[PDB]
Amino acid sequence: VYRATHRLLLLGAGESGKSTIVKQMRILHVKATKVQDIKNNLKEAIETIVAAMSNLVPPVELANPENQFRVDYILSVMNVPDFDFPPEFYEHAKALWEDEGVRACYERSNEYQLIDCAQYFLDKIDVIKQDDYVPSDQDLLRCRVLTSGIFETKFQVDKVNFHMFDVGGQRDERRKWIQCFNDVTAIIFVVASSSYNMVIREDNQTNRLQEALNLFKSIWNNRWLRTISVILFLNKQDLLAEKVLAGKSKIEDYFPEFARYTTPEDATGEDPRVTRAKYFIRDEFLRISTASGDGRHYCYPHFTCAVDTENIRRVFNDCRDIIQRMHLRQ
Amino acid sequence: ARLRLETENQRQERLVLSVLPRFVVLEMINDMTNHQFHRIYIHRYENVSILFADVKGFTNLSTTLSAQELVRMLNELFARFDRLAHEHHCLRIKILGDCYYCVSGLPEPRQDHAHCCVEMGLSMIKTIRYVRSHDVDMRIGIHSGSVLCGVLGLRKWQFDVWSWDVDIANKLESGGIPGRIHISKATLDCLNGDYNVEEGHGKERNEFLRKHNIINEMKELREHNENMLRNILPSHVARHFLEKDRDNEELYSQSYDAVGVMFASIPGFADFYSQTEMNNQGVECLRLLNEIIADFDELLGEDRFQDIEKIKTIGSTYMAVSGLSPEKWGHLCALADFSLALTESIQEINKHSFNNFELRIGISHGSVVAGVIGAKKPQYDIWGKTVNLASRMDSTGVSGRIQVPEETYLILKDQGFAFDYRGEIYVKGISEQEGKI
Numbered sequence: 001v002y003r004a005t006h007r008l009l010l011l012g013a014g015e016s017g018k019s020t021i022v023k024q025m026r027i028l029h030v031k032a033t034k035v036q037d038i039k040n041n042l043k044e045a046i047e048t049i050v051a052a053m054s055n056l057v058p059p060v061e062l063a064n065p066e067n068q069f070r071v072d073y074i075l076s077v078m079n080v081p082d083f084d085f086p087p088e089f090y091e092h093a094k095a096l097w098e099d100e101g102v103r104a105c106y107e108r109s110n111e112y113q114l115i116d117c118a119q120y121f122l123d124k125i126d127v128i129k130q131d132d133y134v135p136s137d138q139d140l141l142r143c144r145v146l147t148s149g150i151f152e153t154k155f156q157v158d159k160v161n162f163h164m165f166d167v168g169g170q171r172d173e174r175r176k177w178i179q180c181f182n183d184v185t186a187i188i189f190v191v192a193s194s195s196y197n198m199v200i201r202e203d204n205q206t207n208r209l210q211e212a213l214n215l216f217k218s219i220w221n222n223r224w225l226r227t228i229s230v231i232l233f234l235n236k237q238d239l240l241a242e243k244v245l246a247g248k249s250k251i252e253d254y255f256p257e258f259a260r261y262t263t264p265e266d267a268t269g270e271d272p273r274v275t276r277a278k279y280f281i282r283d284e285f286l287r288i289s290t291a292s293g294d295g296r297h298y299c300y301p302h303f304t305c306a307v308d309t310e311n312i313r314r315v316f317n318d319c320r321d322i323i324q325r326m327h328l329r330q
Numbered sequence: 331a332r333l334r335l336e337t338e339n340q341r342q343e344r345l346v347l348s349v350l351p352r353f354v355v356l357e358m359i360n361d362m363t364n365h366q367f368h369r370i371y372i373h374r375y376e377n378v379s380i381l382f383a384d385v386k387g388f389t390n391l392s393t394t395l396s397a398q399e400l401v402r403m404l405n406e407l408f409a410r411f412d413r414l415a416h417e418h419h420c421l422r423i424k425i426l427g428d429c430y431y432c433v434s435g436l437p438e439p440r441q442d443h444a445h446c447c448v449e450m451g452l453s454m455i456k457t458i459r460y461v462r463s464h465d466v467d468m469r470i471g472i473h474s475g476s477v478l479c480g481v482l483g484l485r486k487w488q489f490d491v492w493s494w495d496v497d498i499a500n501k502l503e504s505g506g507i508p509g510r511i512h513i514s515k516a517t518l519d520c521l522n523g524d525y526n527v528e529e530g531h532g533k534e535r536n537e538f539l540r541k542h543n544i545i546n547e548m549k550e551l552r553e554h555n556e557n558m559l560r561n562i563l564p565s566h567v568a569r570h571f572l573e574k575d576r577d578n579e580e581l582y583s584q585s586y587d588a589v590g591v592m593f594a595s596i597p598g599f600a601d602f603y604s605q606t607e608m609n610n611q612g613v614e615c616l617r618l619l620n621e622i623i624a625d626f627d628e629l630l631g632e633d634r635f636q637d638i639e640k641i642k643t644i645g646s647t648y649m650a651v652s653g654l655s656p657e658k659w660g661h662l663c664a665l666a667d668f669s670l671a672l673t674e675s676i677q678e679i680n681k682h683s684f685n686n687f688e689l690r691i692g693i694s695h696g697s698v699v700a701g702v703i704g705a706k707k708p709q710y711d712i713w714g715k716t717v718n719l720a721s722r723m724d725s726t727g728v729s730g731r732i733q734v735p736e737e738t739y740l741i742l743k744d745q746g747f748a749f750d751y752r753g754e755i756y757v758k759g760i761s762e763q764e765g766k767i
């Protein structure tokens with residue numbers, strides 16, 4: 001029954017949402033440390049905000065001098081990795097978040113590296129002050145954690161067995177992927193879309209999306225993975241939509257071919273720019289696929305949002321039909 | 331005609347089955363009668379025990395007597411080695427320089443490896459007694475664990491075993507205390523507690539990982555077997571081994587004058603190896619290694635390198651000789667091209683994978699003695715001073731760069747005169763080797 005187990009793996013750059021998509025799929029159908037992770041994600045988010053408040057090359061003003069004491073407090077607790085969760089510091093962080101300077105720094109967070117969930121996590125401070133509420137499914141899927149070792153997850157659907165292979169995206173872990181390049185039914189490629197504007201934290205020069213696209217070119221053209229027909233799940237679509245609707249940043253900041261690009265004919269409340277952005281990233285992946293196509297691997301782009309559920313289930317149903325087709329070796 | 335064909339086919343099959351045990355040769359022969367990866371014949375095995383040997387005084391005897399007599403004594407000692415080993419349910423894996431290792435119960439489960447330990451003690455005392463009639467002392471390293479067995483490459487396949495346990499055994503033998511065994515806990519817990527053993531080594535090896543040293547159908551079958559012969563052993567040696575005079579003449583040898591030797595190594599592979607729970611037991615790592623070696627062999631067969639003959643592969647180390655078959659110094663140019671092509675091949679497989687691998691290359695020139703050292707198992711081999719000179723030039727080299735002996739050519743430029751490495755025989759300052767220009 002080796003074939004009957006549809007084993008498939010996700011490959012992509014760091015913070016592309018693969019672990020989140022695994023968690024969302026798991027809760028869609030098949031603790032104290034989790035709450036700790038919520039708190040720690042909040043801590044690092046606010047820490048990075050206030051560190052880049054001053055470390056940023058263009059200085060940003062502070063709303064009120066009275067919060068300079070809290071800024072010094074957070075600077076003192078910056079180098080400290082101790083797991084401190086005092087209500088006083090929660091009140092301090094609440095005071096900072098209502099300052100216009102901190103909000104402006106968050107809006108200017110595109111210059112440095114910051115976790116994506118921060119904003120949402122920055123609205124959970126009032127209820128995380130109590131530290132007693134049970135986290136919701138949205139809260140669980142908003143949690144941020146790193147993945148280094150490759151992970152396998154059981155799966156069952158329509159009375160058949162699937163296997164999830166979630167691997168790391170950091171360059172240090174890119175050597176481990178060959179450990180699972182064999183006998184895999186399909187590849188579920190996941191690339192963070194809204195992270196087009198970010199850059200990698202491994203080098204601090206190259207864009208996260210550019211690095212992801214180069215990794216996709218490597219994976220698709222790999223001389224050992226030529227009969228597996230990768231399936232594309234571009235995550236991060238909701239943040240991409242809100243970012244383009246914001247208007248502060250656009251794809252032309254990094255890819256003027258988008259400015260030359262025009263909307264395709266396969267368009268599906270909406271706006272032209274967001275639709276053509278998602279379609280353009282899909283079309284760039286498809287261009288890399290077809291230009292390196294060999295007649296055996298086929299790319300089926302499908303737009304995904306990990307935090308969403310209806311989108312998750314719809315795209316997962318489409319992909320499950322695709323995997324059911326490919327299983328028979330048509 | 332049918333009887334004659336059956337007899338000759340049986341003889342040829344037995345010549346193969348001298349090496350390459352049944353459980354893998356069956357899979358190969360099944361594959362010949364009719365893939366995202368190059369395919370590999372490794373199977374996991376448990377409850378295996380690894381012995382090791384190494385002449386500690388080979389540097390104290392290689393210089394004294396010539397290569398021919400040294401080969402004579404090495405052949406007689408290794409013939410005793412192999413016979414006494416086959417007496418005690420032990421099968422040689424390979425012979426490399428002076429090293430010699432065997433496993434316990436690989437084709438089928440078996441234990442009681444201490445019998446082979448006392449057997450090794452008796453054999454070693456016999457060898458030293460024969461030699462006295464020069465320091466030829468040797469160290470015993472035995473470790474128990476689980477291994478992966480199989481063959482790699484598309485030319486000169488040999489039975490080989492890879493694991494972390496065999497690495498521990500290699501380190502145990504490399505420890506020292508000649509004439510005494512390394513009987514680390516993995517063997518004490520397995521064998522028994524009634525055996526009298528000491529406290530173990532004080533400190534000789536690097537304190538790392540805490541080793542705790544304490545008619546048409548018959549014709550088709552004949553064609554398949556002939557193909558496998560041609561893919562295992564050299565043509566003339568295979569012809570000599572097919573007919574009589576396999577055992578009547580113990581040593582088959584010949585000395586050659588204008589010979590070159592090349593060694594290449596991949597030090598970083600020990601980095602990439604990892605025996606976790608997801609990748610079965612590192613089988614994917616050995617798949618990558620088999621891909622590398624297959625690329626090297628596929629590069630070998632091309633028309634641009636005809637006078638170079640692959641001999642053996644020690645781990646990720648490639649040994650290739652030149653001048654053995656005379657049919658001028660263009661063959662050393664061919665060896666240099668071989669090294670350059672190997673470097674480009676490993677860089678290509680670097681870029682195809684997602685890690686970094688580098689090659690250490692050492693070339694030497696001189697006169698060698700080439701022959702077969704094992705009558706029961708056909709293992710073509712080389713010996714001589716230049717052999718260990720090349721081995722040291724490879725081991726005492728810098729990764730990603732090619733080291734060269736005294737310059738005897740000018741076609742493609744070299745660089746790096748100021749090395750003056752101490753070596754092991756004497757100090758010798760000779761340049762290094764880059765590409766064509």
Ligand SMILES: Nc1nc2c(ncn2[C@@H]2O[C@H](COP(=O)(O)OP(=O)(O)OP(O)(O)=S)[C@@H](O)[C@H]2O)c(=O)[nH]1
Binds near residue numbers: 015016
């Ligand atoms: N708002 C929003 N947040 C998302 C979305 N997708 C993922 N996230 C959040 O982004 C974070 C990063 O996801 P994660 O799964 O950790 O990336 P990763 O690729 O596994 O990280 P790595 O191991 O490669 S470094 C998660 O905490 C998740 O909550 C999304 O579509 N919308």
Ligand SMILES: C=C[C@@]1(C)CC(=O)[C@]2(O)[C@@]3(C)[C@@H](O)CCC(C)(C)[C@@H]3[C@H](O)[C@H](OC(C)=O)[C@@]2(C)O1
Binds near residue numbers: 492
């Ligand atoms: C590829 C396998 C791996 C990682 C582990 C292993 O068992 C080895 O193959 C042995 C020990 C093993 O094959 C026994 C022979 C010999 C020649 C001692 C090998 C080399 O030491 C290899 O190291 C090299 C690369 O020289 C090494 C150690 O590398």
Ligand SMILES: [Mg+2]
Binds near residue numbers: 145147167
């Ligand atoms: Mg992850």
